[PDB]
Amino acid sequence: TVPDRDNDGIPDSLEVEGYTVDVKNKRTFLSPWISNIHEKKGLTKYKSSPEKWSTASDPYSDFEKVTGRIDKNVSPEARHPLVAAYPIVHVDMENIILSKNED
């Protein structure tokens, strides 16, 4: 049984030394990073915190992020484990209607 301290599904040594996700047939593999074969495919190299279930502290595990098992609305640049995925919600008031309360 491979070690996994943060319980996120990515093995610790993979998280520290680098890794990547790659479909082979129609299934995704979580391969450890390899210069000779992955770099040609344009696969991103991922590093994350072995001890944090989410490295960015946002509510999506590093595994969920890199494999895409995630809320799809999460914008693609935030799919990367080191990029925090959080809402920024501001309200703007398009116009204000007062009605005088007069008998």
Partner 1 sequence: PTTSLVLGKNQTLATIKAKENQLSQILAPNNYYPSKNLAPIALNAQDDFSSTPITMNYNQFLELEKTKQLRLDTDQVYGNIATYNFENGRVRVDTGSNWSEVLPQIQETTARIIFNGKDLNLVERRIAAVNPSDPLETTKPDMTLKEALKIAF
The annotated binding site for Ca(2+) is made up of: 4, 6, 8, 10, 15, 49, 52, 62
Site pattern 14..53 for partner 1 (x: CB under 8 A): --x----xxx--xxx------------------xxxxxxx
Binding of residue 58 to Ca ion (CB under 5 A): no
Query: By the 8 A CB rule, do 20 and 43 touch?
Result: yes
Q: Quick one: which segment of 24-32, 38-46, 58-66, 82-90 binds a copy of itself (CB under 8 A)? A: 24-32
